[PDB]
Amino acid sequence: NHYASKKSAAESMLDIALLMANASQLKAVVEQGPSFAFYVPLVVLISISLVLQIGVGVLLIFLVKYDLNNPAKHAKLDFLNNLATGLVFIIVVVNIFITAF
Amino acid sequence: NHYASKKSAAESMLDIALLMANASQLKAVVEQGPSFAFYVPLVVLISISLVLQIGVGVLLIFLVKYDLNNPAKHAKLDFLNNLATGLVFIIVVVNIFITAF
Amino acid sequence: NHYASKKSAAESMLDIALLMANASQLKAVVEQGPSFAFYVPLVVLISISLVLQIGVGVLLIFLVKYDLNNPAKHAKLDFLNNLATGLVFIIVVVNIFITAF
Amino acid sequence: NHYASKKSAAESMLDIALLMANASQLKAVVEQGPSFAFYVPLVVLISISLVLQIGVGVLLIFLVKYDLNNPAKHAKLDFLNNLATGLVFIIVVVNIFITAF
Amino acid sequence: NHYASKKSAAESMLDIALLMANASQLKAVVEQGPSFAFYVPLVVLISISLVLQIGVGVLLIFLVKYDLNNPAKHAKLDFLNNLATGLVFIIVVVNIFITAF
Amino acid sequence: NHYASKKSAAESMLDIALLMANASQLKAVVEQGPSFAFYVPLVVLISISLVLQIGVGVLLIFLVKYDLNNPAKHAKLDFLNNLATGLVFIIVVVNIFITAF
Ligand SMILES: CC(C)CCC[C@@H](C)[C@H]1CC[C@H]2[C@@H]3CC=C4C[C@@H](O)CC[C@]4(C)[C@H]3CC[C@]12C
Ligand SMILES: CC(C)CCC[C@@H](C)[C@H]1CC[C@H]2[C@@H]3CC=C4C[C@@H](O)CC[C@]4(C)[C@H]3CC[C@]12C
Ligand SMILES: CC(C)CCC[C@@H](C)[C@H]1CC[C@H]2[C@@H]3CC=C4C[C@@H](O)CC[C@]4(C)[C@H]3CC[C@]12C
Ligand SMILES: CC(C)CCC[C@@H](C)[C@H]1CC[C@H]2[C@@H]3CC=C4C[C@@H](O)CC[C@]4(C)[C@H]3CC[C@]12C
Ligand SMILES: CC(C)CCC[C@@H](C)[C@H]1CC[C@H]2[C@@H]3CC=C4C[C@@H](O)CC[C@]4(C)[C@H]3CC[C@]12C
Ligand SMILES: CC(C)CCC[C@@H](C)[C@H]1CC[C@H]2[C@@H]3CC=C4C[C@@H](O)CC[C@]4(C)[C@H]3CC[C@]12C
């Protein structure tokens, strides 16, 4: 099976529990309604968190391939790693505030 | 039997359990009625998910052929693998939200 | 007997068990009546699958002849195999939905 | 402006007048209601017609490539032209019935 | 415009006045209902007539291409022309009966 | 000023009048209410169109640099151009359907 091989290499560029955690709390706040406090900050915090994770996922997909095919661009490769590290860093900050609120 | 060989080679370019999972809940949400909540997001999420899987399968069918007949275009083949990985990646992200909602 | 030889070679160009499977539900959905839910999506889904199986079978009949008589046109023969695989891939996707619905 | 250059090349691979004609009548039949006759055959005919135009467009987009970059694979190139011609041939036949109904 | 060129090339493989006539009378007999006599023969004759025209059109698309790319197989091309001529012969015979009834 | 040059180089990578059109129609459909018909298809089509426009903008931003610094990999650049053309094709189809509805 070729799709399973693609699926295995596609789940290796992200985590599963956090999106399941993110989706479950996004679902809970939606049904409760705008009457509940912190509705507006929670929706935007989840939305920006999901977008950043998607951007990191596509970033990681195209990054590990440079680790094998052509590592000549030593300077460029490190800068991409730091950007991925920084994007994950801001992701966990939103998740810290999401759980707190 | 020549059709059996085609079916085996075409069933190996995708997964089956996920497609039945999408179709089973698609019937459930459609027959349940628009009155129940999350009807609209589930319908569009399943619809876009199914469309991408067809595109991935079509992408994969024309992909494994180049792995044997002519591997000279390494750059084009390597990028095509990355695009397939990204499309599968966004499929599992949508599927995570479908089960949650 | 020459017709028996043609029948054997023509039955190898398609699958058999699925055909009565498609035919049996087509009779059931037609006999039960339009009042039964999901009637309309069932007829079109069965109809398109039946049309595509005929196209695939016709494609398979004219394809194996080139495999022995004249295999020089490798590029054209290779693409025909991919088209046959892609067409069958649509068949398996569609049949999943009739089974689910 | 680079986007407009892409748009000009992308509009050269399809027709606009038929698409608005298909979309205008799709809106009319949908908004009119299922009470009027020929509701279903019109919807499925437009739907299969619309899918084929997208399939023709992507076929034509990747077909202009081979006429200039590498015309060495002639036999594959002529066959792809016939498939592109065949796909459009079905589209006009379908549109004839849409106009009549 | 490349789609217009394909449409023009696919327009030369069939006629318009006959298809619109067939579709117009198909709508008339269908709307009137089975109460009006000759309903069953009219539907089947129009149905088989339309099927052959698509087969003739697809036949003509793949036939004129051999007239220019590779005319070496004169014997096979001659037989194909007779089949196309024969297929048109039954089409015009069938259409005579549709007008008569 | 260095920010003005970046603004010009970023505005040259996309079309703007379509952006005011999309924003205005989105505001209209959002404000006038869900009671209006075609509300949901309009909203989802506008959303996917905007997402695709951002994707095309990013593609063009990262592709224009590739045209000058290192043109050695012709195949990858040409395939990226084809992908951008197809994305603009689907964007213009979605915008046609938005205008129709
Ligand atoms: C804009 C930032 C802050 C968030 C969004 C990030 C996403 C959409 C973008 C921004 C930077 C982009 C990367 C920039 C450079 C490269 C190197 C190239 O050879 C492969 C693609 C890759 C790896 C890009 C992938 C997409 C990318 C990760
Ligand atoms: C339009 C994109 C974003 C989503 C839909 C993907 C489908 C419709 C398209 C987009 C990319 C396409 C592929 C791009 C390149 C090639 C290499 C060619 O030698 C065989 C076909 C193949 C493999 C194409 C098949 C069709 C394809 C898979
Ligand atoms: C039109 C498409 C999308 C669906 C219908 C498929 C049928 C009607 C058509 C489309 C492509 C066609 C094939 C194209 C090329 C050849 C190779 C030739 O040596 C024998 C006929 C054969 C094998 C054709 C048989 C009929 C065929 C299979
Ligand atoms: C599945 C068929 C019957 C209908 C849908 C057609 C679309 C989705 C598919 C089927 C055949 C495909 C083409 C097959 C071969 C080529 C030649 C290659 O150099 C570029 C991609 C291109 C041009 C593909 C693009 C996508 C394509 C046009
Ligand atoms: C079976 C007959 C009586 C009716 C149906 C006709 C259609 C479906 C079939 C039957 C014979 C077929 C043709 C047989 C041989 C060729 C020559 C080849 O170079 C291109 C395809 C082409 C032109 C085929 C196209 C499809 C075709 C015309
Ligand atoms: C996922 C696809 C189908 C739609 C979304 C497109 C965006 C998110 C992605 C997918 C393809 C990506 C591009 C793929 C390849 C390259 C070439 C490199 O030199 C610069 C980055 C660039 C240009 C990427 C930028 C980000 C990109 C445009």
From Swiss-Prot, chains A, B, C, D, E, F:
Q: Which residues lie on this side of the membrane: Cytoplasmic?
A: 66-75
**Stated consequence of mutating residue 62 to V:** In mutant M5(cyto); decreased ability to mediate plasma membrane rupture
Q: Which parts of this chain are annotated as the region Required to induce plasma membrane rupture? A: 2-31
Please give the record's induction comment: By nerve injury both in dorsal root ganglion neurons and in Schwann cells.
Substitution effect: residue 44 to W: Does not affect ability to homooligomerize and mediate plasma membrane rupture (cytolysis)
Q: Which residues are glycosylated?
A: 22
Q: Could you say what the effect of mutating residue 11 to K is?
A: Strongly reduced ability to mediate plasma membrane rupture
State the residue spans of region: Helix alpha1. 6-17
Annotated site location: Cleavage: 18-19
Reported impact of residue 76 to E: Slightly reduced ability to mediate plasma membrane rupture
**A GO CC term?**
extracellular region
What would changing residue 15 to A do, according to UniProt? Strongly reduced ability to homooligomerize and mediate plasma membrane rupture (cytolysis)
Please tell me, according to the UniProt entry, what happens when changing residue 55 to V.
Answer: In mutant M5(cyto); decreased ability to mediate plasma membrane rupture
How is expression of this protein distributed across tissues? Widely expressed in both adult and embryonic tissues, primarily those of epithelial origin.
Q: Which GO terms describe its biological process?
A: angiogenesis; cell adhesion; cellular hyperosmotic response; cytolysis; ferroptosis; heterotypic cell-cell adhesion; killing of cells of another organism; leukocyte chemotaxis involved in inflammatory response
**Which effect does the record note for changing residue 48 to F?**
Reduced ability to mediate plasma membrane rupture
What keywords are annotated for this sequence in UniProt?
A: Acetylation, Angiogenesis, Cell adhesion, Cell membrane, Cytolysis, Glycoprotein, Inflammatory response, Membrane, Phosphoprotein, Secreted, Synapse, Transmembrane, Transmembrane helix
Can you name this protein? Ninjurin-1
Per UniProt, what is the name of the gene that codes for the protein in this document? NINJ1
Span within the full-length protein is 39 to 139 of 152
